[PDB]
Amino acid sequence: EMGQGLHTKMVQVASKALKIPISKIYISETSTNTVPNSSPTAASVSTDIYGQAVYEACQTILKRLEPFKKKNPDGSWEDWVMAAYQDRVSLSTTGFYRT
Amino acid sequence: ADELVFFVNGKKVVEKNADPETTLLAYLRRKLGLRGTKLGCGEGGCGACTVMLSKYDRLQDKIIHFSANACLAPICTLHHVAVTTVEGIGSTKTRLHPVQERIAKSHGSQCGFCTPGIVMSMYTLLRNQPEPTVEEIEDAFQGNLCRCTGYRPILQGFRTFAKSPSLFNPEEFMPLDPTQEPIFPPELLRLKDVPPKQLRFEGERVTWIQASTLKELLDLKAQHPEAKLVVGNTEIGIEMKFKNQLFPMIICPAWIPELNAVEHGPEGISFGAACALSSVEKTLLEAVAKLPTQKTEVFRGVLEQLRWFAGKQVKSVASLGGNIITASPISDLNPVFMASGTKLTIVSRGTRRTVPMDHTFFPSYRKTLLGPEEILLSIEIPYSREDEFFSAFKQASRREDDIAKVTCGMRVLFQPGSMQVKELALCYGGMADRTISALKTTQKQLSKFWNEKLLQDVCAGLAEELSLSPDAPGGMIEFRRTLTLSFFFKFYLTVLKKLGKDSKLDPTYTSATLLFQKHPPANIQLFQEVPNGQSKEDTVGRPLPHLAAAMQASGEAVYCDDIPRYENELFLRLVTSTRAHAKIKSIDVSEAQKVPGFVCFLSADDIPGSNETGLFNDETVFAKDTVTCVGHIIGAVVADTPEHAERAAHVVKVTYEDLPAIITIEDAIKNNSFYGSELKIEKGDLKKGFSEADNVVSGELYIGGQDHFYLETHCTIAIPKGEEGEMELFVSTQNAMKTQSFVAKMLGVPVNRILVRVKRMGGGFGGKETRSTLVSVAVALAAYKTGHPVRCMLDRNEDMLITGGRHPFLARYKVGFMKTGTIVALEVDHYSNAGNSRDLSHSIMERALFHMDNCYKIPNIRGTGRLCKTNLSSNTAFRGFGGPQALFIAENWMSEVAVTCGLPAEEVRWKNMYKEGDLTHFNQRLEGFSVPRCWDECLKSSQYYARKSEVDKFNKENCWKKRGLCIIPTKFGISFTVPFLNQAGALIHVYTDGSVLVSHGGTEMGQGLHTKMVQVASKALKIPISKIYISETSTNTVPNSSPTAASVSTDIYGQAVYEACQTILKRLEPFKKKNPDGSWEDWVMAAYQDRVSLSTTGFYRTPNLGYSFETNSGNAFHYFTYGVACSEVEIDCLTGDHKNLRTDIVMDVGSSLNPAIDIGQVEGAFVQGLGLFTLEELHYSPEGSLHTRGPSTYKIPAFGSIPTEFRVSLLRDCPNKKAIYASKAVGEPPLFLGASVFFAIKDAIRAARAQHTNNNTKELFRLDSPATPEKIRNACVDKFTTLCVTGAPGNCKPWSLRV
Amino acid sequence: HFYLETHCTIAIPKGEEGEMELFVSTQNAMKTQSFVAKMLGVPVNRILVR
Amino acid sequence: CDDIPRYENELFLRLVTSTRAHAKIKSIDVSEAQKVPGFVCFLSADDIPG
Ligand SMILES: Cc1cc2nc3c(=O)[nH]c(=O)nc-3n(C[C@@H](O)[C@@H](O)[C@H](O)COP(=O)(O)OP(=O)(O)OC[C@H]3O[C@@H](n4cnc5c(N)ncnc54)[C@H](O)[C@@H]3O)c2cc1C
Ligand SMILES: Nc1nc2c(c(=O)[nH]1)N[C@H]1C(S)=C(S)[C@@H](COP(=O)(O)O)O[C@H]1N2
Ligand SMILES: O=C(O)c1ccccc1O
Ligand code: MOS
Ligand code: MOS
Ligand code: FES
Ligand code: FES
Ligand SMILES: [Ca+2]
């Protein structure tokens, strides 16, 4: 983030893909121990490619939460996440994109 | 004056404004930034702060080197002294010193917090003796404690300085070359030819005057009688730090030559009052070696005491004058100086007198017959005369560096060549509030002859004259009185032997006159070599040392508090309750606010979020309205320095209104005070079982608690980022996830705002899996409120008081068995003291129930469990998690079954043992039950049967010493008994240079988990471990992690890491195929260029788990880890002390991922269990106030506590398909094996009781844990214990009898 | 460029295995990481750029 | 970046740069710099470990 609002946009994207308020999503910083071998933030494509990578990681999460959502359709995002946790289903995932 | 000049690692230090209250430790860490030296207790008992001091000695015209505790050394005593820390002898950036290299490569370093101090003790030794003996090497560590290793490796590695595969190879060690050692600071050498001048230092509250001459000392004292002298500061330092003592004016007379003079006169040897005890020891040893035995009787007595007097660090700074004038009730020297009428030369300006120390020298508590203007100039220890004999004895809890329970000095003068008493003096310590002489008793024996009648008359006299009321401070009334008579008995016999000339006693009575004797160590470790075809780069199964061992030995390894503080960082001090249960009526911070640097007082009202916390939302972050235990956190003070925060907090005044308190398990039962309902597992038919049973035994047993005593106490640094409630914390915890959510809950912000990072812990052992949040949340609140970073590291006393420990257990049992020993029915009701909150108490009781069978098949069985809710700090996880308590209870009734049946214990245990395929009481199948092999193998390698003979023989030839032998098995179920915790995540990145960064949910606390994880990654990816790295554990890399516990970390994280590596391998596969002959680096780069992601997570969920208490079905564990231990001991029936002669252990850890780490885990766990069952004991006042708050009173196993012959074997060819690379969890399983020592002791006591107690061979006497010297001695009933019968003395027979 | 915030870097040496954590005003954490590692002569996994 | 609080022991670096567009570096003298209060060290090419 250098003022172009990339994090704002990635939160907006994650929020849509996951179908939850942006208020439940947060981006703290950029670091080499969370995401390695990253290209520089340049070429005006950051939204294009990181938006895609964030999207993919979100789909993964959604696929893992599916069974719980299907079991408790009227439940809350919070109910599904906890149920997923209690069932020892991983709640962490990478996402990647290649133009 | 004004300027203080000294050196640290060869560098000159000039302090222009030295504050008399500043310790070297603080100065090194804060001022110089040298964090290698650690704070472990600030009490002188752990040695973690050990450093070397060097100076020019004007007398020996030589540079001398000695060790010292930086925590007790005032920098104001260090003018013109050269200090050497761990970073001054070597480092991984330059080159490690042999001492550092060897302790690291010998696997002598685990969590590594104690390593720097032990390194410096060894270094100091070598600096004095380049080729020390094995005995000198062990004695070098009398003042150093380690909680992880079990000590064996440290000694064995250092043994190389003296003079099947191996864990390390001594042939690769770099030779010690003293010519390459750091040279004494040249500048200091010049300053040696300049006469000392009085120096003056002015601090915030204290003024220090370093007197250069005797005249200056006297003038100052004549002018300022209040002035407190200080030499070694090993007493004053304690008084100021722990007794709230403040001395505005201090005078250090250490430089005065008159106070350092040593003179050999006609009547004895005189020492200046400032001479260090180590100097006295040296001079006296020489005198004893050069002079005739008949003249060194008294010197020998002093040497016996010095032998067990603190450690090298304290004896090298503690002075003679200091010990005498401190006038402590438990001084080990004053009773000796008194009994020998040692001469004291006391002076004052214009006056001078010399008197023999006698009973009058100590009028009352902490006082002497010194005038306020007088100072002790010198002491002359008397030469022994003809017909004059002397003895000195000391009995404490632990042999090394411990406080005396009872200590004494004994002397007798006979008429020329007669056995007729001319003079007799029996002086004791620990029997009153001062050193006393049993004058009434001794006066009656004047002119009497040394015989049986005199022995009886003296014992009866002592029992009467040295009485103790039921409220005597320190308790242990029966034990202490028994020791006073036992010591005399030992003196009596010794004198007989001496009068017998020798240059005769019943042979069975001879060992009673013998002083403690060390025995040559003999350690052997057996493990399996890796398959010959295995690749060199595949380290799984190899004895790879801990990845951080070298950095831990060099002091470069960073622990939480070693992290530099920010320019604006503040310090936090918790304000806790001093009442077990009361309403908080008022909190006054008026005085606290006046303390310099005061920033603020935090309480429940300051919490922005919720004040409800705890694993079960059972607790408050800050007590509101009421306190429910001593130590209950009420609030906290934030200040500019640690000192100021501590001072401010101390004066925070809380007014209370007591409420009825429930302290003990018995209390809880009576009041029906419990958490939840009864826990129970029942199988078979009890009524039927007891019916078919030939015999039936009932009883009650108790197991005391235990303090984790991790060398590094609790600690947290909280960094507020000032954005969106974000906070980054560095914490010493095994549970980053709970830390994160508890901080978030208290603050009222989303969990994604909190980042918790754990690089490593200097030990955890379960004490940091939940209770670490008590500090983390409070520090987080401080950071939130001030907007400044804040940190807090607990002092030892706060840690032991507040953080909880192992759950004490009380058990009521009843067992049915056949005359053959077979068990047919068992009923056990367990009760645990849980404290003022639930925490992990429920799961702990569950694990207890799961192990109430140990390794025995019991057809009809019923075990229940109740959690006692009490007004004590909440107890929690501790290596074993309930298993040791339940296993101990099991082995106890099992031992009584053998005794009752009159059959060999090993025989009774074997026929009751489970067999492959059996089901446990909770119906789980035992597959791959390897106890049998461990058992037969241990029996054989230990030579059990043959030694059973050696023991019986010894017991026939010895009357006041006995031996015991016992072989014990164990099984420990592996997995968290809470299903959902059996999950693990990992995250791995491969950078474009091919280096790999691995991250997993587990934390490093010294157990070698990261090391094992790197080994697993290297094998899985088929690349060298040198290309892989693990930096830390953090919530932003691997979320929702289970606490690092239950011994399953390697199992589950190993699997998650493995999976992550598979995915990596899958992605690189296409490139490896394209370029087969290429390198790992070529493939990675190619993958990167083709835009293939080199980052992935890994996850693992342990399969088939889910036990139900309702249906008594389902698998509670993934598999079991097994082991067997045989220990042999020798007890002193007269004092309670005992030797752990030998122990043999055979452990089944499947195919070990690292035999150095495993084995290190086996030895470490065994020693902690050893401590739990025989040495460690916590004492509380009737009101629930913990007395035992430091290493001085809480004695964990020391270097000299381990079995002299310590042999460990890892079972061969026993792959476990239920875990990563066929390995097995090892963390907790071996701990209970320490009980083998407890039962060997019980065996010995049985022999002693058959010797002087009853005649009832099948007698079943109760022995609770820990089997401390008190319990051992009281159990050895004899004519002495009878004359000391607590209460019911010879004066209390009832008027009538007949029910 | 005239970014209102000029170039800036904070480098924190951890004292272990060449580890270093850096807080930098940069659009390229990867290259900062590798260039720092190249200059120091240590594996890239030792350097953390935030 | 620079808003991040400094550690109690944090130091500061100031780059030493060329005043010529193209030239051989004949000599470098830090004798005057060494006398400035607070001076810690001057780093040059030979200090690079990698
Ligand atoms: C971990 C640890 C273990 C210990 N173990 C033992 C043990 O096994 N047995 C035992 O007996 N003690 C033990 N002690 C206490 C022992 O170290 C002190 O008694 C020591 O001998 C005191 O000498 P010092 O020079 O440190 O005294 P200081 O702390 O300086 O204290 C001395 C006190 O004596 C006064 N004083 C000192 N010198 C003189 C003088 N010349 N003339 C007049 N007054 C004087 C001071 O004013 C002060 O009141 C231990 C202490 C620690 C911290
Ligand atoms: N050196 C050291 N070893 C240790 C501990 C420790 O704190 N320090 N904790 C013990 C406890 S209580 C457990 S549960 C396991 C923890 O790690 P693991 O699951 O990998 O074996 O290690 C054991 N070994
Ligand atoms: O079973 C365990 O050993 C255990 C340990 C820590 C927390 C919960 C648990 O069930
Ligand atoms: O010039 Mo922008 O592509 S960084
Ligand atoms: O007692 Mo260890 O399960 S943390
Ligand atoms: S901290 Fe100095 S002896 Fe423990
Ligand atoms: S390695 Fe010694 S206390 Fe941890
Ligand atoms: Ca509890």
Series of H and E elements of chain A: HHH
Q: Give the ligands present.
A: flavin-adenine dinucleotide, the ligand Nc1nc2c(c(=O)[nH]1)N[C@H]1C(S)=C(S)[C@@H](COP(=O)(O)O)O[C@H]1N2, 2-hydroxybenzoic acid, dioxothiomolybdenum(VI) ion, FE2/S2 (inorganic) cluster, calcium ion
Number of helices of chain A: 3
CATH class placement of chain A: Alpha Beta
- CATH H-level homologous superfamily name of chain A: Aldehyde oxidase/xanthine dehydrogenase, molybdopterin binding domain
Percent range for helical residues of chain A?
40-55%
Separation of termini of chain A? 21 Å
For the record, the count of structural domains of chain A works out to: 1
| CATH structural fold name of chain A | Aldehyde Oxidoreductase, domain 4
Can you tell me the CATH architecture of chain A?
A: 2-Layer Sandwich
**Shape summary of chain A:** elongated
What's the gyration radius of chain A in Å? 15 Å
Find the count of extended strands of chain A (DSSP E, 2+ residues): 0
Q: Which chain pair has the greatest contact?
A: A-B, 21 and 33 residues
Main β-sheet description of chain A: none
Structural class designation of chain A? mainly alpha
Strand percent estimate of chain A = under 5%
**Which oligomerization state do the chains in this entry correspond to?**
part of a larger assembly
Family (chain D): Belongs to the xanthine dehydrogenase family.
Subunit structure (chain D): Homodimer. Interacts with BTN1A1.
Subcellular location (chain D): Cytoplasm; Peroxisome; Secreted
Function (chain D): Key enzyme in purine degradation. Catalyzes the oxidation of hypoxanthine to xanthine. Catalyzes the oxidation of xanthine to uric acid. Contributes to the generation of reactive oxygen species.
